[PDB]
Design a protein around this ligand. Structure first.
Ligand SMILES: NC(=O)c1ccc[n+]([C@@H]2O[C@H](COP(=O)([O-])OP(=O)(O)OC[C@H]3O[C@@H](n4cnc5c(N)ncnc54)[C@H](O)[C@@H]3O)[C@@H](O)[C@H]2O)c1
Ligand SMILES: NC(=O)c1ccc[n+]([C@@H]2O[C@H](COP(=O)([O-])OP(=O)(O)OC[C@H]3O[C@@H](n4cnc5c(N)ncnc54)[C@H](O)[C@@H]3O)[C@@H](O)[C@H]2O)c1
Lengths: 291, 294
């Protein structure tokens, strides 16, 4: 049973790396935050090894990192994964970064002759905890096929999008752009409904079998709005960061997406008003403030 | 309880097929429209014409209205020759028009003064939905009256819903339904243009998003029935979506509410119409945004 490396043991990485240990893998963990390392260790993971030592020793190494800088700091340079990867290693980045960085990563992997997949994930911490993540994978199909079963203990839907390394990332950004639209629509629509004294429960039962339906509507309303609980979940701040990546790509693709750009501002304002660390469904509360 | 004699005022885009479906369903239907061709077409199927609004109110068990505006509704319901002043003591009036919550309330206040029954039951689904009896009825008003008339409305639609005893509740839910459509069509249109611009396989992408939190009935509708096959025949026009968005925005502004994205969407669909997509399906907002592709 394989040796897996896991770099980034935060909100997503901790439950993912824990699940691998529970699944019977020997898991070596690295995180800048020694407390995160402590938590992973208590789950049965092994700490104390360098990023470089993970690259030399592990069959597959996953990364779950919070920014493009962090991904760059881990993959590149004399101490990083690509320079130190043994000849059979597979690296799988689950971080969300720009398509361009996906390409820069792949180009360094091809130069070192190591395997690399850009496999961003969807489903949040709840999905990570429950092994129901969606993996959207760009990169070599042979590498996908040989690591599909490991990713399959972490997620419920494992997809290969195409051989293009940024194909996963792109579908993910699209997914999250749609989420931004759906959350905004629910937030504004329900505010109108409430101001006019609608029973939001009866309304949902009707709209949920109409063209008003969306999984996000069901999520936001049933799991947050109805129970008056805005504990993340998936933050206003994280959604706005993803919308940022999507608008960046739109701008690089010479596209003006007027409602998308407005939404970036909507979530940015929700944050600046103090809902940044609330669940995205709290956009409802932000829009309702005026009542 | 007798529900054989049905009046139907407004034999237009929706009324004509609805009224004929009532005839086909064994009801004795008395129809009224300014449009003599519409009256003749109805009569030709076994509809009865030549009776006044007044006469329908006096003699019919239930009278439906399908009218094009608030003023048309007012002209039919109020005044000496109208429905309320001439309704017999057991009549039920059902308006299937879309008007403001405020008019729904004024209609009901007049119904209560006259001690007649009234439901505000706006329909959605277009001409084809009316023909195929797949309309949605979203109904506000008395539950007892709803329970009494559900069986008739049900021969005309697939989804018949009683929302609440608030007379405007059906209208309000209809408006919210259409507002969510506006958002969802906008997201699909913008998000797929981004995907297309970056050469994504839109079929594969749908397979993935349709079982992820990108999922919506509108995404399935717009993508599989319109965008994928490059068909932009309505369906549900840009122009009619934006009319209903306008009504949602009017209701908001009435309630002192600022809904910035909603107001922005009203303008997006107005610009889409101005660019030439007004009588296309709403899914054509994708083609509007896609004008930016190479
Ligand atoms: N949290 C979610 O709901 C969610 C959902 C889908 C995708 N994601 C994506 O997953 C990625 C990780 O997200 P997260 O929520 O777990 O972030 P997080 O900030 O909770 O965790 C990231 C971890 O990486 C560690 N780290 C940072 N730089 C490092 C370095 N050089 N070496 C080692 N460790 C380093 C941090 O200490 C932190 O513990 C992000 O790209 C995010 O977009 C998150
Ligand atoms: N067209 C659609 O696709 C559609 C779909 C769903 C809902 N609706 C709604 O249903 C309602 C009716 O729409 P429509 O397209 O059928 O309108 P329309 O203009 O085709 O039909 C209304 C009919 O009422 C008649 N009329 C007007 N005033 C009258 C009067 N005083 N006496 C007798 N007849 C009169 C007109 O001659 C016309 O035939 C509107 O409120 C609209 O918003 C329309």
């Amino acid at each position: 049973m394989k040796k897996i490396g896991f770099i980034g043991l935060g909100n997503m990485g901790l439950p993912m790396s824990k699940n691998l240990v529970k699944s019977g893998y020997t898991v070596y963990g690295v995180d800048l935050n020694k407390e995160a390392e402590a938590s992973f260790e208590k789950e049965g993971g092994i700490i104390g090894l360098s990023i470089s030592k993970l690259a030399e020793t592990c069959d597959v190494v996953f990364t779950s990192l919070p920014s493009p800088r962090a991904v760059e700091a881990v993959y590149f340079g004399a101490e990083g994964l690509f320079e130190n990867g043994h000849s059979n290693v597979v690296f799988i980045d689950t971080s969300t970064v720009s398509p361009q960085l996906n390409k820069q990563l792949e180009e360094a992997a091809k130069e070192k002759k190591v395997d690399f997949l850009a496999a961003p994930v969807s489903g949040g911490v709840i999905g990570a905890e429950n092994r129901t993540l969606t993996f959207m994978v760009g990169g070599s199909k042979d590498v996908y096929e040989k690591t599909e079963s490991i990713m399959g203990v972490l997620g419920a839907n494992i997809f290969h999008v195409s051989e293009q390394i940024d194909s996963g990332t792109t579908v993910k950004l699209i997914n999250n752009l749609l989420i931004g639209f759906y959350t905004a629509g629910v937030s504004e629509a329900l505010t109108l409904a409430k101001k006019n004294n609608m029973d939001l429960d009866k309304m949902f039962d009707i709209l949920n079998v109409s063209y008003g339906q969306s999984r996000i509507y069901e999520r936001n309303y049933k799991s947050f709005i109805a129970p008056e609980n805005y504990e993340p979940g998936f933050t206003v701040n994280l959604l706005k960061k993803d919308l940022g990546f999507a608008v960046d790509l739109a701008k690089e693709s010479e596209l003006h997406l007027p409602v998308s750009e407005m939404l970036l501002n909507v979530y940015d304002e929700a944050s600046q008003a103090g809902y940044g660390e609330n669940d995205m469904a709290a956009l409802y509360k932000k829009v309702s403030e005026q009542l």
